[PDB]
Short mmCIF file of N, CA and C (backbone and C1' of nucleotides) in Angstrom, two decimals:
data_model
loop_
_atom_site.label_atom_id
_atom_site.label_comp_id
_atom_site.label_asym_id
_atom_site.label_seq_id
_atom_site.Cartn_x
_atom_site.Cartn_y
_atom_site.Cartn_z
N UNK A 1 54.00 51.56 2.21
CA UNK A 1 54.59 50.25 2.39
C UNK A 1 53.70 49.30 3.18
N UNK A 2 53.83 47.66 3.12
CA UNK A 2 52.94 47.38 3.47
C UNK A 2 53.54 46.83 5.20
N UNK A 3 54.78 47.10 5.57
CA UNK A 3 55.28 47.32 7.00
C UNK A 3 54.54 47.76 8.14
N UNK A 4 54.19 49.51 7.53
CA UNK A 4 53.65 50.41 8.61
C UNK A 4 52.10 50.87 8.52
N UNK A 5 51.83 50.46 7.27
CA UNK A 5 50.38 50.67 6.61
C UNK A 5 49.95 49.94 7.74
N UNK A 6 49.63 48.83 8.16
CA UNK A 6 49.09 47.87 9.44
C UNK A 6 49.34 48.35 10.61
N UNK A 7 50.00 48.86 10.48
CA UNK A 7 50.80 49.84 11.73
C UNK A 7 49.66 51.41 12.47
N UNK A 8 49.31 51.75 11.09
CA UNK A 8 48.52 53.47 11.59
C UNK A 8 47.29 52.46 11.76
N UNK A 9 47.00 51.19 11.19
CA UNK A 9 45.01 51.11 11.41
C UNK A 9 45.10 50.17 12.78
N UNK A 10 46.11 50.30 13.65
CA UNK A 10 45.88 49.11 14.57
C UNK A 10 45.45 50.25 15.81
N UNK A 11 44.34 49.22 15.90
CA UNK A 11 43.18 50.03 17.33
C UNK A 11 43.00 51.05 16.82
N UNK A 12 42.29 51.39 15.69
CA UNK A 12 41.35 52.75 14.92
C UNK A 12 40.04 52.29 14.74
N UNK A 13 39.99 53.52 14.72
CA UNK A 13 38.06 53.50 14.06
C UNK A 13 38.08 53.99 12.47
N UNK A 14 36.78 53.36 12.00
CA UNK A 14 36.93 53.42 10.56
C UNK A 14 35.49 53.82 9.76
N UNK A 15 35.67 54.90 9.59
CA UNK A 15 34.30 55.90 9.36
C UNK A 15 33.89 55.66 7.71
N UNK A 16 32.74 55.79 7.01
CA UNK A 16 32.58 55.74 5.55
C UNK A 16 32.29 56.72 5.21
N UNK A 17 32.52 57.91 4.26
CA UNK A 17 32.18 59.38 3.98
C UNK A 17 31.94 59.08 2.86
N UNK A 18 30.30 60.07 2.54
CA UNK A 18 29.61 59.80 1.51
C UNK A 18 29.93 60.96 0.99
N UNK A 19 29.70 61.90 -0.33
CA UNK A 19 29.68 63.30 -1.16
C UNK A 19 28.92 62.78 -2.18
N UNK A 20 27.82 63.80 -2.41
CA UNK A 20 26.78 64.05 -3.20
C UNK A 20 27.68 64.12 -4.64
N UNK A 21 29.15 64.47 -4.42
CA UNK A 21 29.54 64.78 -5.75
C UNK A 21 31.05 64.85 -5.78
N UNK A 22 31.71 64.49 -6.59
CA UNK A 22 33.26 63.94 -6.64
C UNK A 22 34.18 65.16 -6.79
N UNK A 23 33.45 66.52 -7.20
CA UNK A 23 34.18 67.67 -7.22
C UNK A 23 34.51 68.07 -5.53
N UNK A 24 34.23 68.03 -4.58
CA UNK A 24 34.59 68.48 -3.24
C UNK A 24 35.39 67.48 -2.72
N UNK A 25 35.00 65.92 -3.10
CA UNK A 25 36.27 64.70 -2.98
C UNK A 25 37.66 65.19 -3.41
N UNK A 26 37.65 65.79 -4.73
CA UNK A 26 38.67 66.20 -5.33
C UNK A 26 39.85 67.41 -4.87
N UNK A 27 38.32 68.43 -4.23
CA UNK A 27 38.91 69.16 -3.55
C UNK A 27 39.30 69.22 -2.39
N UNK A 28 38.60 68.06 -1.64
CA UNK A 28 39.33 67.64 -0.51
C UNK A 28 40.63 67.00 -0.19
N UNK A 29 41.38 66.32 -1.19
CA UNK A 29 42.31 66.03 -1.21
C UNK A 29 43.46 67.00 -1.84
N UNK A 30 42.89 67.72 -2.54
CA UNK A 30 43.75 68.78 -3.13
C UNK A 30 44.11 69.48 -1.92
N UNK A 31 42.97 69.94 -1.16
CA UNK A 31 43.23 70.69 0.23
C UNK A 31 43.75 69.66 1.28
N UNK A 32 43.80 68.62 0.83
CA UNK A 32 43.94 67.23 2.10
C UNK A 32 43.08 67.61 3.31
N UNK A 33 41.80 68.55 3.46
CA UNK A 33 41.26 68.52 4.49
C UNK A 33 39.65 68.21 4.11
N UNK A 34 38.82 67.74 4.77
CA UNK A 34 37.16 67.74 5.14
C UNK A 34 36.02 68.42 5.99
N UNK A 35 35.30 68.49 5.17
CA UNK A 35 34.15 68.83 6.36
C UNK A 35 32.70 68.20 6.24
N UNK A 36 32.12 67.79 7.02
CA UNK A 36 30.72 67.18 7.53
C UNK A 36 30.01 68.25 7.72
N UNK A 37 28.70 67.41 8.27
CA UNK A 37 27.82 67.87 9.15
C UNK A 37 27.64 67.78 10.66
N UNK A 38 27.06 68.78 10.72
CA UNK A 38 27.20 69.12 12.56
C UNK A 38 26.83 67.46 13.84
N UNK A 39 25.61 66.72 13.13
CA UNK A 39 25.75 65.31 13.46
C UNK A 39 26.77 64.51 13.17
N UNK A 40 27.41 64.31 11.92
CA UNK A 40 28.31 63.40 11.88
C UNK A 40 29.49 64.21 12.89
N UNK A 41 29.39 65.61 12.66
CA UNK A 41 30.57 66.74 13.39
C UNK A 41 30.81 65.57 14.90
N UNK A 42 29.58 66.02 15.42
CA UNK A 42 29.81 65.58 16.74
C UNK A 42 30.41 64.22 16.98
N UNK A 43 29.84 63.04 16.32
CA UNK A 43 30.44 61.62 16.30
C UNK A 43 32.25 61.90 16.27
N UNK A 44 32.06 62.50 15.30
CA UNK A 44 33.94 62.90 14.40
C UNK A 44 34.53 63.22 15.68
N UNK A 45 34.28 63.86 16.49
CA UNK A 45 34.68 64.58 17.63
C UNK A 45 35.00 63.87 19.04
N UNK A 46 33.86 62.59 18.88
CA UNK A 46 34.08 61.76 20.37
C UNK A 46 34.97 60.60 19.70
N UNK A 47 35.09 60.62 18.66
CA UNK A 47 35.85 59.55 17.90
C UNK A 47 37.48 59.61 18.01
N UNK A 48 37.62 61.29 17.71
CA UNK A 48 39.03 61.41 17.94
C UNK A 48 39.84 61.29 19.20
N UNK A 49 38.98 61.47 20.17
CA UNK A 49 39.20 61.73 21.37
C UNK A 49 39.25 59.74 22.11
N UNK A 50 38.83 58.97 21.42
CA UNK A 50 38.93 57.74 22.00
C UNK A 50 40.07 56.47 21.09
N UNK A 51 40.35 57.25 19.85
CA UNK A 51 40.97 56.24 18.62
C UNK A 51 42.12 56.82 18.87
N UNK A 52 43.21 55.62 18.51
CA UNK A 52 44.72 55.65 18.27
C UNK A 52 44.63 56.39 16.77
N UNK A 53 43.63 55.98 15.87
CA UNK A 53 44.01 56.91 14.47
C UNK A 53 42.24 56.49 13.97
N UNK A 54 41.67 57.50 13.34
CA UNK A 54 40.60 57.59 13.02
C UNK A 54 40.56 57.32 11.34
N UNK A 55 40.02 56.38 10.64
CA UNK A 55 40.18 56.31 8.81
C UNK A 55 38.78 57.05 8.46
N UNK A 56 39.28 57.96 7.73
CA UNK A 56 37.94 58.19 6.76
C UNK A 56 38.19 58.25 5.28
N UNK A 57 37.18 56.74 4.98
CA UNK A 57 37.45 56.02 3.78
C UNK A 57 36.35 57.01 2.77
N UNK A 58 36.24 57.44 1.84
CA UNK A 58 35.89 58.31 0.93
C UNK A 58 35.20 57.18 -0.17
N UNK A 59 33.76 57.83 -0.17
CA UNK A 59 32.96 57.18 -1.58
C UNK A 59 32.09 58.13 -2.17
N UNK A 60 32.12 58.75 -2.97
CA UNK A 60 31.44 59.45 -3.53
C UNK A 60 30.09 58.81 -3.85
N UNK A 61 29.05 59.41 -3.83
CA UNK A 61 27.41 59.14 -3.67
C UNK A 61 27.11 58.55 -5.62
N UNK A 62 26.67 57.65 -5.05
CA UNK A 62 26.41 57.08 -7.12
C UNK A 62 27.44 57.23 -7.70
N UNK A 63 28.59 56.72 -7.02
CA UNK A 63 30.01 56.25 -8.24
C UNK A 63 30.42 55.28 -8.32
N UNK A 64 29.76 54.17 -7.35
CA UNK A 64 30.20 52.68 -7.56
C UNK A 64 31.34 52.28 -6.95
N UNK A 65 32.65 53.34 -6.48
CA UNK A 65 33.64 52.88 -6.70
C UNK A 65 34.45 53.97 -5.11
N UNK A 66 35.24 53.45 -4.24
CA UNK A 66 35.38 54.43 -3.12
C UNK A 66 37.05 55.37 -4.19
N UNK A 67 37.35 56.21 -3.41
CA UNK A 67 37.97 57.18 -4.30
C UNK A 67 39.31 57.78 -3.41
N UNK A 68 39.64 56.41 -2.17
CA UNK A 68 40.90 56.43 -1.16
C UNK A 68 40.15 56.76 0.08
N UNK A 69 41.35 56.68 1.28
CA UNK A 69 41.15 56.79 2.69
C UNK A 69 42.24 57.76 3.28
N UNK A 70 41.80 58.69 4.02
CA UNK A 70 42.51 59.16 4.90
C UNK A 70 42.52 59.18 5.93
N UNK A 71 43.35 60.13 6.98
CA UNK A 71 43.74 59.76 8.10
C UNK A 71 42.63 61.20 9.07
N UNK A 72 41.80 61.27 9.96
CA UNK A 72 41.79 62.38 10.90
C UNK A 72 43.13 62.86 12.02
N UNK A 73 43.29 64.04 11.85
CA UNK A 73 44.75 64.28 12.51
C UNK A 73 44.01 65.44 13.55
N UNK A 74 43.05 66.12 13.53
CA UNK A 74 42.43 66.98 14.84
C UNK A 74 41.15 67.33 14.41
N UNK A 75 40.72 68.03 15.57
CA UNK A 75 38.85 68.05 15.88
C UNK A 75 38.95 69.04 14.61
N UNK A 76 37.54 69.35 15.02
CA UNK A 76 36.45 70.50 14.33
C UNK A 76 36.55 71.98 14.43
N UNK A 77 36.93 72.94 14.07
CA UNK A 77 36.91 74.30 14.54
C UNK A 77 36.45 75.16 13.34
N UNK A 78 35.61 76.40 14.25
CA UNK A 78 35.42 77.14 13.11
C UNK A 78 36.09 78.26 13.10
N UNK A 79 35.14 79.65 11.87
CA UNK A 79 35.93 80.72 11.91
C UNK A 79 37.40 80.80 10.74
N UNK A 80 37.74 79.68 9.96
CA UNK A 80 39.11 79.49 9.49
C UNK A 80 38.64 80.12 8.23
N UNK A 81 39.75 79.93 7.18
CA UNK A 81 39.32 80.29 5.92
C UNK A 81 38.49 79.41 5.01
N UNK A 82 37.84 80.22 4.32
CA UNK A 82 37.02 79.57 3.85
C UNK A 82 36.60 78.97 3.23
N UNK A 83 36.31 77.79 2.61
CA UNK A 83 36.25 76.33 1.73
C UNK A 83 35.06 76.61 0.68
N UNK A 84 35.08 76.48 -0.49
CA UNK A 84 34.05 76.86 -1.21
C UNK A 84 33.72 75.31 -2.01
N UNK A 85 33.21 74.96 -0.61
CA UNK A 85 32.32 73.60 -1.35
C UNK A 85 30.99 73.72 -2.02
N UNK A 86 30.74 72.49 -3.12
CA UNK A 86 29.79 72.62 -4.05
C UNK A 86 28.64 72.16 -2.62
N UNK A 87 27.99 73.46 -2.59
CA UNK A 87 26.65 73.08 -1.37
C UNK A 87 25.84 71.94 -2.21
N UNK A 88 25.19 70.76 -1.67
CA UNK A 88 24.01 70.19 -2.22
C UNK A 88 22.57 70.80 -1.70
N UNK A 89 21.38 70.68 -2.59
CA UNK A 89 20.35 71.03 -2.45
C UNK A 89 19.97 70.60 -0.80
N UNK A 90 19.23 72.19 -0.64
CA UNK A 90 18.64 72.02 0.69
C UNK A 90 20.32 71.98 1.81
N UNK A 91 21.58 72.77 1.70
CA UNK A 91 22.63 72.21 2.77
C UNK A 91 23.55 73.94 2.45
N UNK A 92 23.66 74.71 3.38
CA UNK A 92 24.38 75.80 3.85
C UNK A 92 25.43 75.46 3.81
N UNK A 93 26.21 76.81 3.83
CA UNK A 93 27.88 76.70 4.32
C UNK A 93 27.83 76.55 5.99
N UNK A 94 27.11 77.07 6.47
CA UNK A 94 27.00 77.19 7.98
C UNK A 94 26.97 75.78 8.37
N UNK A 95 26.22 75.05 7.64
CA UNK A 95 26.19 73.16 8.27
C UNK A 95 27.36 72.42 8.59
N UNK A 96 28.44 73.36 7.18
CA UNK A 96 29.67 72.39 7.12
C UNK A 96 30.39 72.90 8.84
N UNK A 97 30.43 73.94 9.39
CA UNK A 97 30.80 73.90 10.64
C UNK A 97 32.22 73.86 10.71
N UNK A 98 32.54 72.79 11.33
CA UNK A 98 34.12 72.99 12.08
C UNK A 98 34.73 72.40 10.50
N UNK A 99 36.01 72.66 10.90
CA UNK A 99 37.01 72.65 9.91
C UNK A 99 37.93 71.04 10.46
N UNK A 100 37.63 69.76 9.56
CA UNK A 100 38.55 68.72 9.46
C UNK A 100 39.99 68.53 8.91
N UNK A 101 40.80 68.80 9.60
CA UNK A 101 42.42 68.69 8.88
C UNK A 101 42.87 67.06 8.59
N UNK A 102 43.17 66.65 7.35
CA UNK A 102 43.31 65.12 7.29
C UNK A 102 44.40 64.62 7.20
N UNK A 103 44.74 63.29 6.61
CA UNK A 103 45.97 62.96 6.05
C UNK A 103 45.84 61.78 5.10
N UNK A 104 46.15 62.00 4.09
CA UNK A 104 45.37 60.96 3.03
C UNK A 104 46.54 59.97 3.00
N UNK A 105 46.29 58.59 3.10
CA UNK A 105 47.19 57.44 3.02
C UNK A 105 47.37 56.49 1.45
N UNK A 106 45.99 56.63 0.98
CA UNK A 106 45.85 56.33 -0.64
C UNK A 106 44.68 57.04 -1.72
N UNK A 107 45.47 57.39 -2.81
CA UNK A 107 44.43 57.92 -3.29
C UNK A 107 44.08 57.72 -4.33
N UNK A 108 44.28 56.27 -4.63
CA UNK A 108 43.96 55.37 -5.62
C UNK A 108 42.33 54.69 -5.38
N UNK A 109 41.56 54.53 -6.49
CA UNK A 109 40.15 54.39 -6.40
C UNK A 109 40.24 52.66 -6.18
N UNK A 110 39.17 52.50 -6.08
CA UNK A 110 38.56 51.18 -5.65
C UNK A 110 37.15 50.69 -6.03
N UNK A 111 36.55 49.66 -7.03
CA UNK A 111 35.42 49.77 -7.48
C UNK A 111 35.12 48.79 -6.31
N UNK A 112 33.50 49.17 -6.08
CA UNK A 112 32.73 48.02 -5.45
C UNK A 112 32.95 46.36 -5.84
N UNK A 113 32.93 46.19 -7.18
CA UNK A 113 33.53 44.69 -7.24
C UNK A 113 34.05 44.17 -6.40
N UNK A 114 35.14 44.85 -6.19
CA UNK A 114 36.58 44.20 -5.34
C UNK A 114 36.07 43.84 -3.64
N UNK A 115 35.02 44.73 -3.61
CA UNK A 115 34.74 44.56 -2.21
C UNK A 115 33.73 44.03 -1.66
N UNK A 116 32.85 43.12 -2.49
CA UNK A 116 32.04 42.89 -2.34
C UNK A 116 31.51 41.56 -1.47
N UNK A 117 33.04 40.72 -1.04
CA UNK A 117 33.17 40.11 0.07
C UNK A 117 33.06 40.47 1.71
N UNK A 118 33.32 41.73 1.37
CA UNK A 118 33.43 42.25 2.61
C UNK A 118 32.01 42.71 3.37
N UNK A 119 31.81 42.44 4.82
CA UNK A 119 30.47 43.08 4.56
C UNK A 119 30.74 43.32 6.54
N UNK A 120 29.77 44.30 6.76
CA UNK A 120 30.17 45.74 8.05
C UNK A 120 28.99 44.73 9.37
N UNK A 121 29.76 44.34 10.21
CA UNK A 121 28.89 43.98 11.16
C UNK A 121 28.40 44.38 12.12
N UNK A 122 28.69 46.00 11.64
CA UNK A 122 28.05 47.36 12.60
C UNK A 122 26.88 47.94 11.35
N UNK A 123 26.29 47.16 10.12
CA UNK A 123 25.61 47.70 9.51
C UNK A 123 24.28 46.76 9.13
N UNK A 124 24.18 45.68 10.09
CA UNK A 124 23.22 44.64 9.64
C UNK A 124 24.29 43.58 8.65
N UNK A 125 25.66 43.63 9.18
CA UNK A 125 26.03 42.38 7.98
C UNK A 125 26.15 42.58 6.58
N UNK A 126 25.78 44.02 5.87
CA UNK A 126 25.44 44.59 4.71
C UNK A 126 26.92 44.47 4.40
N UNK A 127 27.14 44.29 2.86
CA UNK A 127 28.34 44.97 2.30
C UNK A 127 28.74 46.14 2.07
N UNK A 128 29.98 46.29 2.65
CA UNK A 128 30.79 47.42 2.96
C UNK A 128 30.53 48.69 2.34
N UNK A 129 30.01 48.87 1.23
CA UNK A 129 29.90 49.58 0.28
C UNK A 129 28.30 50.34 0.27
N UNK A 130 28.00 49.85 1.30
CA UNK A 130 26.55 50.09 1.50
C UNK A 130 26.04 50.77 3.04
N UNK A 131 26.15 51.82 3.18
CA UNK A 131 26.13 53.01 4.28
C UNK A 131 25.87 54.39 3.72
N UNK A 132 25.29 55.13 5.09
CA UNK A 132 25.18 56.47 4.73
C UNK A 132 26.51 57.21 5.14
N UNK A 133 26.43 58.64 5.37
CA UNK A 133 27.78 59.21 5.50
C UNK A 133 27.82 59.29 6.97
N UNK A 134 29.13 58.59 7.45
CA UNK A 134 29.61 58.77 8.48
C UNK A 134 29.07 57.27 9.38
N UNK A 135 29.25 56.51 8.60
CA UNK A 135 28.67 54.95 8.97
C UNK A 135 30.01 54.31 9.74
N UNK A 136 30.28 54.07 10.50
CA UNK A 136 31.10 53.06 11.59
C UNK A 136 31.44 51.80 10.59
N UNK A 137 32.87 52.05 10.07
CA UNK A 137 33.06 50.37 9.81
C UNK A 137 33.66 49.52 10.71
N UNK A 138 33.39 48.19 11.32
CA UNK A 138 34.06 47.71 11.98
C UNK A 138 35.40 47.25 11.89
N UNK A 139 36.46 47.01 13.09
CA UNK A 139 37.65 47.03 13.01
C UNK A 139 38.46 46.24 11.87
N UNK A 140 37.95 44.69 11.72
CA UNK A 140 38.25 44.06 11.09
C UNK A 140 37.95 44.01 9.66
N UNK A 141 37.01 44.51 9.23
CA UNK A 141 36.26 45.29 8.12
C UNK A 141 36.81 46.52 7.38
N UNK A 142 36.92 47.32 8.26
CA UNK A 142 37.79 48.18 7.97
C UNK A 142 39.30 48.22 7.72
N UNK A 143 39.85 47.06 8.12
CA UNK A 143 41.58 46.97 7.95
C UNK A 143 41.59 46.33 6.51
N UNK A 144 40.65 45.32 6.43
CA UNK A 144 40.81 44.47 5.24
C UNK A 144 40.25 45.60 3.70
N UNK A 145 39.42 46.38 4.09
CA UNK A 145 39.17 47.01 3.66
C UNK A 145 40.20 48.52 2.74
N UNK A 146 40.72 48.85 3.72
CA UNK A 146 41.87 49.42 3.23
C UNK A 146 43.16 48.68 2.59
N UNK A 147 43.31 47.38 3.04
CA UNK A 147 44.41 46.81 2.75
C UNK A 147 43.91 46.38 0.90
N UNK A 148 42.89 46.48 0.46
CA UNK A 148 42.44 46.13 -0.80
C UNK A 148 42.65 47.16 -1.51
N UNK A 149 43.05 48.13 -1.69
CA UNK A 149 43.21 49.64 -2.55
C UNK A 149 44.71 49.51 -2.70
N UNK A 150 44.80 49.57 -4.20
CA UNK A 150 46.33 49.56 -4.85
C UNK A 150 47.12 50.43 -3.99
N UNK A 151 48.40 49.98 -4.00
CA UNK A 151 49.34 51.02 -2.71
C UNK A 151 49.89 52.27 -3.79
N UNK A 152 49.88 53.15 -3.22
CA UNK A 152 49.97 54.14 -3.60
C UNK A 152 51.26 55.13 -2.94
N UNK A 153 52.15 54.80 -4.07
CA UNK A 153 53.46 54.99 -3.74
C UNK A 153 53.93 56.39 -3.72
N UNK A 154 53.06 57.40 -4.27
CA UNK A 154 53.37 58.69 -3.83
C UNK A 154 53.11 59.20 -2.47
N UNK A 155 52.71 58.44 -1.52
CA UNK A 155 52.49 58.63 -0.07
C UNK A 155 53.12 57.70 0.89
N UNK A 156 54.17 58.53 1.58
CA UNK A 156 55.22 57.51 2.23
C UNK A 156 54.58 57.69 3.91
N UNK A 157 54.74 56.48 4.70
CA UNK A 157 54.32 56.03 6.11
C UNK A 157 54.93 56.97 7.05
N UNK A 158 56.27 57.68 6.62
CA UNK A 158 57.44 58.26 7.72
C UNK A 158 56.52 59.68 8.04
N UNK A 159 55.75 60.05 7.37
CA UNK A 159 55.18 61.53 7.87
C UNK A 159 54.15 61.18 8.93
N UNK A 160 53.42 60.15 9.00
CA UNK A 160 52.29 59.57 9.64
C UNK A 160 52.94 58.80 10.91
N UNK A 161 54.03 59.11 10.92
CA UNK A 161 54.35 57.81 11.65
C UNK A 161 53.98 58.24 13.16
N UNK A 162 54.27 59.20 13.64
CA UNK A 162 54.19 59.38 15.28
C UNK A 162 53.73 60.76 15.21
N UNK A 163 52.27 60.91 14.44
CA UNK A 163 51.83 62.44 14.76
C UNK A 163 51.00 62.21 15.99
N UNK A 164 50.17 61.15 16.28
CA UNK A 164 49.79 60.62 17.42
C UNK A 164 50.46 61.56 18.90
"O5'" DC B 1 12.37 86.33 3.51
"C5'" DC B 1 13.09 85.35 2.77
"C4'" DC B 1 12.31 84.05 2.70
"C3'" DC B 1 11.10 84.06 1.77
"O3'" DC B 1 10.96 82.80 1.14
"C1'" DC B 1 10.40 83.53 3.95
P DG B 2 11.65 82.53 -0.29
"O5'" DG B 2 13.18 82.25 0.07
"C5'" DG B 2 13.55 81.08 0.78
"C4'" DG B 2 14.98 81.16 1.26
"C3'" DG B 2 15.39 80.07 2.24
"O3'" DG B 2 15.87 78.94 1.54
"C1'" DG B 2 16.18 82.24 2.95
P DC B 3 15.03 77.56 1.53
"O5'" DC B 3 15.04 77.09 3.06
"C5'" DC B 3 15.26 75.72 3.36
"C4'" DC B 3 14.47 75.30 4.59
"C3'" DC B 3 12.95 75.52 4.49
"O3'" DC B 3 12.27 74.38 5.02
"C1'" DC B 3 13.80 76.58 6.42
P DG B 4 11.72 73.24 4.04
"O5'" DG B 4 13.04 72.60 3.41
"C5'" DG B 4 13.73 71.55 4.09
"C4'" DG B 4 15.01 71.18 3.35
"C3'" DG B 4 15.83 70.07 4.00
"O3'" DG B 4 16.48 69.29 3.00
"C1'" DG B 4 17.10 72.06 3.93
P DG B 5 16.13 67.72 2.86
"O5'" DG B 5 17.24 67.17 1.85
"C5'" DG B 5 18.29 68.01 1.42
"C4'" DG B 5 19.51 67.86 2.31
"C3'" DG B 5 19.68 66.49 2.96
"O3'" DG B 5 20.66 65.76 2.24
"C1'" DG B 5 20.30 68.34 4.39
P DA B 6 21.13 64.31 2.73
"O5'" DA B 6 22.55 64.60 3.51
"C5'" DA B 6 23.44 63.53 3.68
"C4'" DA B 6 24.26 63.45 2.38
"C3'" DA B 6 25.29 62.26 2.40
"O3'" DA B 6 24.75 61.25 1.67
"C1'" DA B 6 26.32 64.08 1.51
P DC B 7 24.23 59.92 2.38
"O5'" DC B 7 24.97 58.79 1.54
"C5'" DC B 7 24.33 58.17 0.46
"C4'" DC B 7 24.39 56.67 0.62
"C3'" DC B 7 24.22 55.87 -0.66
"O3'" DC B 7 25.50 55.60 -1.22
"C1'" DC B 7 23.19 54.85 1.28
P DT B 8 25.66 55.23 -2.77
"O5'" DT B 8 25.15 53.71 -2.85
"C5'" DT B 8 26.00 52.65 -2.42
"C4'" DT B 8 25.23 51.34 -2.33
"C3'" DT B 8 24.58 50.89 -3.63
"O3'" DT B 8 25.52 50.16 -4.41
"C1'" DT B 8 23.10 50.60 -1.76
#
DNA sequence: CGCGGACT
C-alpha cells in the first residue's frame, strides 16, 4: 500500500546489489534471503546496526532492468545450511560468508528507462542504475527510487510493520 | 597449485 510503503524507507539506507546472473536473484527470493561478499559483508553489518530499515534494491549484472527491493532484517552469520549459489568465475562458497535473512517488499521488475531521471549523489551524480555491488544510494534517491516499481500486491506492509 | 572475485 502506498500508506506504509513510505513508512519502512523513512530514515533507511539504500544499498544497490549487483548478480553476475538472475538465477541466484531468483533464488534469492525464492529463499527470500542473500549473500555478499566479505567487503560488502562488513559495510552490510555497520549498516544494520545504524539504519531504522536497510533496502537492498536488486539488479542483476547486464539486464538493463532492476528485478525488486528488499528489506535487511539481521546481520551475517555463518555455519547455517547451505545455499547452492551459481559461484561466478574466480568466487568460492567460502566468500559468500555470513548468511543475509531478507524481506522482499516488491518483486516486480523495473527497466532502466523509467529511471533514468534519477541520478545517486553518493555516486558522482551518475544515474541510479549505474553502480557496482553494494553502492550507497542516497536517501532521497533511494525513496523515489523504490516508489517507481509497480506495487506489488502479493506483499502486504502488516508483516514488516514493527519487526524493527 | 585450488589463488579469484557480483558497474553502466
Amino acid at each position: 500500500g502506498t500508506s506504509k510503503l513510505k513508512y519502512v524507507l523513512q530514515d533507511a539506507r539504500f544499498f544497490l546489489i549487483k548478480s553476475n546472473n538472475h538465477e541466484n536473484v531468483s533464488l534469492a527470493k525464492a529463499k527470500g534471503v542473500w549473500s555478499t561478499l566479505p567487503v560488502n559483508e562488513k559495510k552490510l553489518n555497520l549498516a544494520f546496526r545504524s539504519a531504522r530499515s536497510v533496502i537492498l534494491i536488486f539488479s542483476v549484472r547486464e539486464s538493463g532492468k532492476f528485478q525488486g527491493f528488499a528489506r535487511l532484517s539481521s546481520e551475517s552469520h555463518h555455519g547455517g545450511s547451505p545455499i547452492h549459489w551459481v559461484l561466478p568465475a574466480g568466487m568460492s562458497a567460502k566468500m559468500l560468508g555470513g548468511v543475509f535473512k531478507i524481506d522482499w517488499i516488491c518483486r516486480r521488475e523495473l527497466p532502466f528507462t523509467k529511471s533514468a531521471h534519477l541520478t545517486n549523489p553518493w555516486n558522482e551524480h551518475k544515474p541510479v542504475k549505474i553502480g557496482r555491488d553494494g553502492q550507497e544510494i542516497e536517501l532521497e534517491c533511494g525513496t523515489q527510487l523504490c516508489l517507481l516499481f509497480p506495487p506489488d500486491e502479493s506483499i502486504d506492509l502488516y508483516q514488516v510493520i514493527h519487526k524493527m
